[PDB]
Amino acid sequence: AYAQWVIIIIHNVGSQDVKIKNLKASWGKLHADGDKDAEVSASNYEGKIVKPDEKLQINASGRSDAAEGTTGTFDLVDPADGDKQVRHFYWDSPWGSKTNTWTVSGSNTKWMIEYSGQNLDSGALGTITVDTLKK
Amino acid sequence: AYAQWVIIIIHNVGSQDVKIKNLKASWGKLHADGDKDAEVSASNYEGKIVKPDEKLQINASGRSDAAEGTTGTFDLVDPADGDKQVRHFYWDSPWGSKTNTWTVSGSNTKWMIEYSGQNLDSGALGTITVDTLKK
Amino acid sequence: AYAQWVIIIIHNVGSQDVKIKNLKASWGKLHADGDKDAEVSASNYEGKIVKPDEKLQINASGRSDAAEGTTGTFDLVDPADGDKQVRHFYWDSPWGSKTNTWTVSGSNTKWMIEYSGQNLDSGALGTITVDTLKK
Amino acid sequence: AYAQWVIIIIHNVGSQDVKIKNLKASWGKLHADGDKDAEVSASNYEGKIVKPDEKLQINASGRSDAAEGTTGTFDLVDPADGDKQVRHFYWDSPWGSKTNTWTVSGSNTKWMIEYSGQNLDSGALGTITVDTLKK
Amino acid sequence: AYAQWVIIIIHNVGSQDVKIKNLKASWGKLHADGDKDAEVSASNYEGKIVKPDEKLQINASGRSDAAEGTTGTFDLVDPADGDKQVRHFYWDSPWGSKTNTWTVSGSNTKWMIEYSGQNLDSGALGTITVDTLKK
Amino acid sequence: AYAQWVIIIIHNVGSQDVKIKNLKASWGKLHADGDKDAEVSASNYEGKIVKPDEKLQINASGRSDAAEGTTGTFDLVDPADGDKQVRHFYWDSPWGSKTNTWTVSGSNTKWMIEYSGQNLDSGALGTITVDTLKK
Amino acid sequence: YQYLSTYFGSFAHDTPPGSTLRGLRPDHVLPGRYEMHGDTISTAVYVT
């Protein structure tokens, strides 16, 4: 359903480029800003570089009025060192459960990543803002 | 009902204090972050001073399983100008009507207020970040 | 029921104090080590300071033959930073559902928390050692 | 049954090699980490040397849903003096009894052995961590 | 029943004090030496200090003609090390089950404990001499 | 019956040899240590010398499940003076009476004999330890 | 008294190099600042 939705805002608070890779929604669909009807392919975001001091928004939502949440993953990768992983992000806003999942796995000591705004209790996964900073 | 909820994050990006006044939840209830069960009173935020660079979170939602949504109002005022009104904020996430409502009124010209993150189509109102600054 | 149980061993490997807060067993009961009959109150651990190199054990389990499992939450906070939250811990070993749950949330970046030993497939949740360190 | 299980973690807290010998499970079966279905022969551990400052894990469990616990023995032996015994370890997590057995017999004044985490009251035998150190 | 009885003779062969704690007869009753009728309270031994070369006798047995056996537990602890536990002793001479039980648990390494004289096949548990020494 | 039993431990606390003579069980049978089924003839102990600083154990018990106790005698004799008597020991743990008998008769001023652990009230005769000393 | 480092090995009371390791009177030392190394607690070492 559209009631299962998530907004992921990648905000570069540093001065080095960061790339988005392997963006894939296994359940649900990526869509446009403020428009859950305008589906957009993952190619619009995969390979994109979030320049420092600007934000990139990824909107995911379940199929219209369906019994399906939205589940997806992407990598944030530093292009300055041959596209090594910074962190692996996984989100899951299911339709038939209360516990939403927002996992940031991986290790990269040269990068610091913060995130806020997620809701894991019940309902939608909300607007998660992720501040990325290369030290 | 808990399906209708709203989070308001007032962020005083400016360099002078801003005060909350007349906070009132006409429908639903306020609560502590992460716990819709832990109801809180409006007095916990009434008259509070948001210092520069400080963030203040107000969480509202419907009651336990009731057919009510949530609705409330408050004011941002300037403590340094005789509590002159800066802005008037109204939020409404109804349970019956699908469309939500987030309205900011006022005409104070020595202030900049920028609100973002609201959802108006269907479901909960969501998380709204309100950046405040005094010119 | 006693078949569902959990042991949590907080080990402050770091060099600065860490405080327990908001310890609450919503289901089942806490008890003294080695004696599930000897129930203990949450106040015996609330506000306790885990000094560096000190180990603190919290034992929870279901009640006497009841169909309940066990479930609880607590917080690690930093006494040296105005009780700023370090982490939020949630444990659940249900009697009905087979799968257990051990969740650690939070975004404190000047702390390292490492938990190991939990069992999530079936049976009791087990023993979980949580090594804490402040950067 | 799988409810009868034991994890034995040999952790070398010294600076001399220690060997595992005569590992034998009379009842139950040795299995993989976090996988009670992947049975492993005792040859995977017999004769292995636990290098200082690293841990070796032995997982034993009863037959699937059977009326059988897990009973076994092994020797820890110092290879520096012609494979003499350090200690003899015996574990018994039966299915038709409450009292689990964890016996560390033998004598070797040149070695100090500590162990913790066992449960002898009822249920599984738990995760026993054994710290070994040659003096 | 008086047919089930146990005598425990703690003998501090070492040169430093050892303290009794948590003495508890869950079944049967304690009594004065040579007189099973002369019941005594656990407080007569709780917290007692066994000086070096001193011997302390604890006599337990079933009640008057009751079908109960006897069962109890206590702890030896080190008064010079903040009452750190030395050993945990459990005794059981059941009236119904033929086999008795005498269990000594603990992992204190700066102490030597040697118990002898128990009978485990049938009848009363007997007399058990427990020589204690601190390294 | 096996319920009627006695253990006699001769412990040389001196520095001179002592001999056991005329060991004879009129009722019951001598048996092995911890094995009431392994009957042993009196020739195994008669004429034996208990070297200083070591213990010799004599186990007597009634016939299996019979209406017969265990009654016996022996001499402790000093071999240094032509096998003169030190003391004459008589034990009686009857099946059809409550009063057990443990008599140490005879006179030898050059020897000091202590004994402890006997029970004369009811039941078995217990484990009697006899410390022998030559002055 | 205090000593400035942890021992990486087995401390030998009576043989070198452990026989010559010494601690200092408290007035000889002042508190320092750590400098951590290693990604994990199992391999975390401070450089005072």
CSV table of N, CA and C in Angstrom, one decimal, chain C residues 20-87:
chain,number,residue,atom,x,y,z
C,20,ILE,N,23.3,2.9,33.3
C,20,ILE,CA,22.0,2.2,32.9
C,20,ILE,C,20.8,3.2,33.3
C,21,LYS,N,19.8,3.2,32.4
C,21,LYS,CA,18.7,4.0,32.7
C,21,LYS,C,17.4,3.4,32.0
C,22,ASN,N,16.3,3.7,32.6
C,22,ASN,CA,15.0,3.3,32.0
C,22,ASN,C,14.9,1.8,31.9
C,23,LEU,N,15.5,1.0,32.7
C,23,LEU,CA,15.4,-0.4,32.7
C,23,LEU,C,14.0,-0.8,33.1
C,24,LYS,N,13.3,-1.6,32.2
C,24,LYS,CA,11.9,-2.0,32.4
C,24,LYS,C,11.7,-3.3,31.7
C,25,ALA,N,11.2,-4.3,32.5
C,25,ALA,CA,10.8,-5.6,32.1
C,25,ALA,C,9.3,-5.6,31.9
C,26,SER,N,8.8,-5.4,30.6
C,26,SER,CA,7.4,-5.3,30.3
C,26,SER,C,6.7,-6.7,30.5
C,27,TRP,N,7.5,-7.7,30.3
C,27,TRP,CA,7.0,-9.1,30.4
C,27,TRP,C,8.0,-9.9,31.2
C,28,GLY,N,7.5,-11.0,31.9
C,28,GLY,CA,8.3,-11.8,32.7
C,28,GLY,C,8.8,-11.0,33.9
C,29,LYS,N,10.0,-11.4,34.4
C,29,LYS,CA,10.5,-10.8,35.7
C,29,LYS,C,12.0,-10.9,35.6
C,30,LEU,N,12.7,-10.0,36.3
C,30,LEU,CA,14.1,-10.0,36.5
C,30,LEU,C,14.4,-10.9,37.8
C,31,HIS,N,15.6,-11.4,37.9
C,31,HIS,CA,15.9,-12.3,39.0
C,31,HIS,C,17.4,-12.3,39.2
C,32,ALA,N,17.8,-12.8,40.4
C,32,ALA,CA,19.3,-12.9,40.7
C,32,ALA,C,19.9,-14.0,40.0
C,33,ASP,N,21.2,-13.9,39.7
C,33,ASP,CA,21.9,-14.9,39.0
C,33,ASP,C,21.8,-16.3,39.6
C,34,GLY,N,21.5,-17.3,38.8
C,34,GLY,CA,21.4,-18.7,39.2
C,34,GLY,C,20.1,-19.1,40.0
C,35,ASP,N,19.2,-18.1,40.2
C,35,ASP,CA,18.0,-18.3,40.9
C,35,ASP,C,16.9,-17.6,40.2
C,36,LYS,N,16.2,-18.3,39.4
C,36,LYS,CA,15.0,-17.7,38.7
C,36,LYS,C,13.9,-17.4,39.7
C,37,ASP,N,13.9,-18.1,40.8
C,37,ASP,CA,12.9,-17.9,41.9
C,37,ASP,C,13.1,-16.5,42.6
C,38,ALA,N,14.3,-16.1,42.8
C,38,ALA,CA,14.7,-14.9,43.5
C,38,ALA,C,14.5,-13.7,42.6
C,39,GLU,N,13.2,-13.2,42.5
C,39,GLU,CA,12.9,-12.1,41.8
C,39,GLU,C,13.5,-10.8,42.4
C,40,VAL,N,13.9,-9.9,41.5
C,40,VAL,CA,14.6,-8.7,41.9
C,40,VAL,C,13.8,-7.5,41.2
C,41,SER,N,14.0,-6.3,41.8
C,41,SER,CA,13.3,-5.1,41.2
C,41,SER,C,14.2,-4.4,40.3
C,42,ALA,N,13.6,-3.7,39.3
C,42,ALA,CA,14.4,-2.9,38.4
C,42,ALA,C,15.2,-1.8,39.0
C,43,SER,N,14.8,-1.4,40.2
C,43,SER,CA,15.6,-0.3,40.9
C,43,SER,C,16.9,-0.8,41.3
C,44,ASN,N,17.1,-2.1,41.4
C,44,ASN,CA,18.5,-2.7,41.8
C,44,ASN,C,19.5,-2.4,40.7
C,45,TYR,N,19.1,-2.0,39.5
C,45,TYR,CA,20.0,-1.7,38.4
C,45,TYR,C,19.8,-0.3,37.8
C,46,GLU,N,18.6,0.3,38.1
C,46,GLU,CA,18.4,1.6,37.5
C,46,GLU,C,19.4,2.7,38.1
C,47,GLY,N,20.0,3.4,37.2
C,47,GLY,CA,20.9,4.5,37.6
C,47,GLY,C,22.3,4.0,38.0
C,48,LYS,N,22.6,2.7,37.8
C,48,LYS,CA,23.8,2.1,38.3
C,48,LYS,C,24.9,2.6,37.3
C,49,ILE,N,26.1,2.8,37.9
C,49,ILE,CA,27.3,3.2,37.1
C,49,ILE,C,28.2,2.0,36.9
C,50,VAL,N,28.5,1.6,35.7
C,50,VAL,CA,29.4,0.6,35.4
C,50,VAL,C,30.7,1.2,35.2
C,51,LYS,N,31.6,1.1,36.2
C,51,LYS,CA,32.9,1.6,36.1
C,51,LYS,C,33.8,0.9,35.0
C,52,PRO,N,34.8,1.5,34.5
C,52,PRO,CA,35.7,0.8,33.6
C,52,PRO,C,36.2,-0.5,34.2
C,53,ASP,N,36.3,-1.6,33.3
C,53,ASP,CA,36.7,-2.9,33.6
C,53,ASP,C,35.6,-3.7,34.5
C,54,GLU,N,34.5,-3.1,34.8
C,54,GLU,CA,33.5,-3.7,35.6
C,54,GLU,C,32.4,-4.4,34.7
C,55,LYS,N,31.9,-5.5,35.2
C,55,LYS,CA,30.8,-6.3,34.5
C,55,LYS,C,29.6,-6.3,35.3
C,56,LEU,N,28.4,-6.1,34.6
C,56,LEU,CA,27.1,-6.0,35.3
C,56,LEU,C,26.2,-7.0,34.6
C,57,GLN,N,25.5,-7.9,35.4
C,57,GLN,CA,24.7,-8.9,34.8
C,57,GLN,C,23.2,-8.6,35.1
C,58,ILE,N,22.4,-8.7,34.1
C,58,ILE,CA,20.9,-8.6,34.2
C,58,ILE,C,20.3,-9.9,33.7
C,59,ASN,N,19.6,-10.6,34.6
C,59,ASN,CA,18.9,-11.8,34.3
C,59,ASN,C,17.4,-11.7,34.3
C,60,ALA,N,16.8,-12.1,33.2
C,60,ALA,CA,15.4,-12.0,33.1
C,60,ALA,C,14.8,-13.3,32.6
C,61,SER,N,13.6,-13.6,32.9
C,61,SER,CA,13.0,-14.9,32.5
C,61,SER,C,11.5,-14.8,32.7
C,62,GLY,N,10.7,-15.7,32.2
C,62,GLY,CA,9.3,-15.7,32.4
C,62,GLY,C,9.0,-16.1,33.8
C,63,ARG,N,7.7,-15.9,34.2
C,63,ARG,CA,7.2,-16.1,35.5
C,63,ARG,C,7.1,-17.6,35.7
C,64,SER,N,6.4,-18.0,36.8
C,64,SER,CA,6.3,-19.4,37.2
C,64,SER,C,5.2,-20.1,36.4
C,65,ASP,N,5.5,-20.8,35.3
C,65,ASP,CA,4.7,-21.7,34.5
C,65,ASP,C,3.7,-20.9,33.7
C,66,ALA,N,3.7,-19.6,33.7
C,66,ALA,CA,2.8,-18.7,32.9
C,66,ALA,C,3.1,-18.9,31.5
C,67,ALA,N,2.1,-18.7,30.6
C,67,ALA,CA,2.3,-18.7,29.2
C,67,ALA,C,3.0,-17.5,28.6
C,68,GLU,N,3.5,-16.6,29.5
C,68,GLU,CA,4.2,-15.4,29.0
C,68,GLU,C,5.7,-15.8,28.7
C,69,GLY,N,6.3,-15.0,27.8
C,69,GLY,CA,7.7,-15.1,27.6
C,69,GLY,C,8.4,-14.1,28.4
C,70,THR,N,9.3,-13.3,27.8
C,70,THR,CA,10.0,-12.2,28.5
C,70,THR,C,10.2,-11.1,27.5
C,71,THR,N,10.2,-9.9,28.0
C,71,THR,CA,10.4,-8.7,27.1
C,71,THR,C,10.8,-7.5,28.0
C,72,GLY,N,11.8,-6.8,27.5
C,72,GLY,CA,12.3,-5.6,28.3
C,72,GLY,C,13.1,-4.7,27.4
C,73,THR,N,13.3,-3.5,28.0
C,73,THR,CA,14.1,-2.4,27.4
C,73,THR,C,14.9,-1.7,28.4
C,74,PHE,N,16.0,-1.1,27.9
C,74,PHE,CA,16.8,-0.2,28.8
C,74,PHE,C,17.6,0.7,27.9
C,75,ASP,N,18.4,1.6,28.5
C,75,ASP,CA,19.2,2.5,27.8
C,75,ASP,C,20.6,2.5,28.5
C,76,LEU,N,21.6,2.6,27.7
C,76,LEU,CA,22.9,3.0,28.1
C,76,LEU,C,23.1,4.5,27.8
C,77,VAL,N,23.6,5.2,28.8
C,77,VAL,CA,23.7,6.7,28.7
C,77,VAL,C,25.1,7.0,29.2
C,78,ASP,N,25.6,8.2,28.8
C,78,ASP,CA,26.9,8.7,29.2
C,78,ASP,C,26.8,9.7,30.4
C,79,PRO,N,27.2,9.3,31.6
C,79,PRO,CA,27.1,10.2,32.7
C,79,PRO,C,27.9,11.4,32.6
C,80,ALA,N,29.0,11.4,31.8
C,80,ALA,CA,29.9,12.5,31.6
C,80,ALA,C,29.5,13.4,30.6
C,81,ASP,N,28.4,13.2,29.9
C,81,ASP,CA,27.9,14.0,28.8
C,81,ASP,C,26.4,14.4,29.1
C,82,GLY,N,26.1,14.7,30.3
C,82,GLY,CA,24.7,15.1,30.7
C,82,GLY,C,23.7,14.0,30.5
C,83,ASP,N,24.1,12.8,30.7
C,83,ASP,CA,23.3,11.6,30.5
C,83,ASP,C,22.8,11.5,29.1
C,84,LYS,N,23.6,11.9,28.1
C,84,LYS,CA,23.3,11.8,26.7
C,84,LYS,C,23.2,10.3,26.4
C,85,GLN,N,22.1,9.9,25.6
C,85,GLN,CA,21.9,8.5,25.3
C,85,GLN,C,23.1,7.9,24.5
C,86,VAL,N,23.6,6.8,24.9
C,86,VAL,CA,24.5,6.0,24.1
C,86,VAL,C,23.8,5.0,23.2
C,87,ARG,N,23.0,4.2,23.8
C,87,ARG,CA,22.3,3.2,23.1
C,87,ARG,C,20.9,2.8,23.7
